[PDB]
Design a protein around this ligand. Sequence first.
Ligand SMILES: [Mn+2]
Ligand SMILES: [Mn+2]
Ligand SMILES: [Mn+2]
Ligand SMILES: [Mn+2]
Lengths: 196, 197, 197, 197
Amino acid sequence: TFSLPALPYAYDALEPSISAQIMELHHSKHHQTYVTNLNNALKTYSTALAANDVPSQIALQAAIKFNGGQHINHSLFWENLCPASSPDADPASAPELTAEIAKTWGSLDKFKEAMGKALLGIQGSGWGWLVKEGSGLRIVTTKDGDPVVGGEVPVFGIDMWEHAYYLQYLNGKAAYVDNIWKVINWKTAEQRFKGD
Amino acid sequence: SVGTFSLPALPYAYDALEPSISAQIMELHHSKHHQTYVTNLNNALKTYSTALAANDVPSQIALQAAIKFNGGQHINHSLFWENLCPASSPDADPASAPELTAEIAKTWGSLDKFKEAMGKALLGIQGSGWGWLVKEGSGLRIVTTKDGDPVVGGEVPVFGIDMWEHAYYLQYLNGKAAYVDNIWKVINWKTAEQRFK
Amino acid sequence: SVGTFSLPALPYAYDALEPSISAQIMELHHSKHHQTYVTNLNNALKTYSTALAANDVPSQIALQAAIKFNGGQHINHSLFWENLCPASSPDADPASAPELTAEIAKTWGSLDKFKEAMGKALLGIQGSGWGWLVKEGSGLRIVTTKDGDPVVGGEVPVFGIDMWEHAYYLQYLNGKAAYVDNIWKVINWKTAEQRFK
Amino acid sequence: VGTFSLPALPYAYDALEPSISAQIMELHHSKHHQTYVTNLNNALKTYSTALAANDVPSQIALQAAIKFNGGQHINHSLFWENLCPASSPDADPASAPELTAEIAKTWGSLDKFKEAMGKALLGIQGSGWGWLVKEGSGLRIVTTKDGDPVVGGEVPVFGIDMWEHAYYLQYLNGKAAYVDNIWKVINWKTAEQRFKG
Ligand SMILES: [Mn+2]
Ligand SMILES: [Mn+2]
Ligand SMILES: [Mn+2]
Ligand SMILES: [Mn+2]
């Protein structure tokens, strides 16, 4: 059975970038619901699979991809976030990653601008990702609850669903993107970039 | 002149839909979200005028997302304000839609059964989108559209409900089910009847 | 166990639908295309069984496209063969579907008007897909599905027409309008009536 | 507005045999591509009215026709130019020095590139195209669905049409044999000019 992962920090640890109210609702309400609906969908699909019930399996695909994708995405999200005062929020905790970032985009600032443009370009709900595809780095977006497709390894992701910022920033998603860089966990991003 | 759309005034004050929809949501939804759609729509249409005259198909294709999203949201929200009214108004009474409710009961069994089917479609939207009651010929149908897409050609919208998180989050938080439960009290059946007929 | 689907036999010989659909098309469509959908559906379902036992959600999501496409095409083509019959058969006469044709004329005005609306939807499909007459509750509706998608849950298919290019190209080349014109002669209205009822 | 024309082929209809039959080449160019050009012109002329009339619902409804027919006009125009007789020096991979160098740099070799491209081509569900594109300085294999053109930011180097009408008359359901034989008629000279300029 899948479970809601515990946060590595308190609900207010990401302030003033992300409010404590958003963090508590995002984790204890939104993410918690994805886990519940994922387990419910998988149990129903198990019956349809054994019964060779293809129509029911097709009907359950949306629930498994959405809730399974959001559970994957939010689990990554909490781990590539950290308090702004921690050394893990310093990009110097990611020597190899930032080196490849500067090789691909020119500089860290240029990468942040391109990432921000992709994040703000999402129409509706979705996520923005820095992913590793082969040996290079790439900025991709995913719609709704879709996870990153097979072949791209997520380095870090930023949730652009309105529930990720609306209570604090209202419709001003640009301010949310500008301020979220202060709480990006570059230690986790370096760990994912290197892999094993 | 191309790209001369404007933000339409609400048929009511910002607090007229309380307690179903808060004045804070109505003001932000209308004066910020809808206004931004109008602005981005006009700019996109003006750029398209140049690409169309120059027979620039690549530029025309690239501008389609902005026109469908901002033009659709301008269409959808303009319809939205008009199929909403204060809960104490006679237009909020389903008896203001004799022909519509008659077809609703013939199609779903009852108004309550239709409300249950509409609610499941609204709450079933993954991500951002709208839920609609549409007219196709003589029958009625419940459809959903994603993001800012408008209802496709051939189906005539009767009324719509915005399921974007900005439509309820400040008041209802993650409780979108409660938002749908309370929005039935402010549905303008008089407007829905006029569109149906 | 998991993944034990088989290719259903045709209700008629490969040349039984001529001159509407050629014997070469019928044999290739059934023994090659449909057989491939059945095989790839079984393989996808067996691979999913492995991913499910391993609690591998990413692998499960990756397999969804293969299951929907091959499972949908297996459902769609199985329906397709059943709503086709020789033009000289009594099942090919629209009088074999009294209740269906009555609702068709009530919804579109006449059978010819319905054929006009169905043909435009069929010819309007961009790329590969199907056109369907479906039952949604008590009403009738014309819908299209893309690639191998089946009709969504809630709509009951009455009959379908395959608009993939492989369904007509060998006989009609790019003239899909002639393909639609001639396929009405081999529609099995008896099966369509049974599905409607 | 909307005055596009069908481009003439650089060769006779039978010049690509035995890889692509003369019957396919004539139908593909004189029938399929010509219809894309015509329907692109019709959509652009209709859009001029909707644009001047500020008819956003009609403009959104016309987007599919403009992207589909405009994309297919772009795709097929590129297609004819990256095809040439197998006996031509342009069919030899040495005609694209800068291009073929990056191909071996990105995939390892030309054969490795053909294996990856073929899998992408055969993996398309329904109708679509497979492309080798240049993004910045690197190369990538991408696919486009139905009539979509290559996205902005990627420069098409050459494309292979995987619509069933591109091979069905000659290869039937064997799209794998179609991909295997089309490598003999790829015009690397045009692919080099697109890669550089
Ligand atoms: Mn979220
Ligand atoms: Mn809205
Ligand atoms: Mn078929
Ligand atoms: Mn083609």
